[PDB]
Amino acid sequence: TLIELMIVVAIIGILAAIAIPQYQNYIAKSQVSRVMSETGSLKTVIETCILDGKTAANCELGWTNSNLLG
């Protein structure tokens, strides 16, 4: 019947009109958190370089190129 097909169309329209809960807030936050860890891994290597008096030029870091530029 036509009414059944129109009900199916209405259900399709209802499902297509779902609300996306602004996922940008999540992923970006996670990315920031990741950077917070990575820069944190550079604490001790800097701190010891501060304590022993080693200069900036010869204070080597174990830093690796991160996927995020941060």
List residues binding its own copies (CB under 8 A). Answer: 2, 5-6, 9, 12-13, 16-17, 20, 23-24, 26-30, 33-34, 36-37, 40, 43, 47, 50-51
Distances (CA, A) of 48 to 14, 44, 68, 70: 61, 6, 26, 22
Distance CA 63, CA 44 (A): 12
- Residue 20 or 57: which CB sits closer to its own copies? 20
- Look up residue 69 and give its amino acid: L
29 vs 61 by CB, closer to its own copies:
29
Instruction: Quote the least distance from Cβ 67 to its own copies, whole Å.
Output: 10
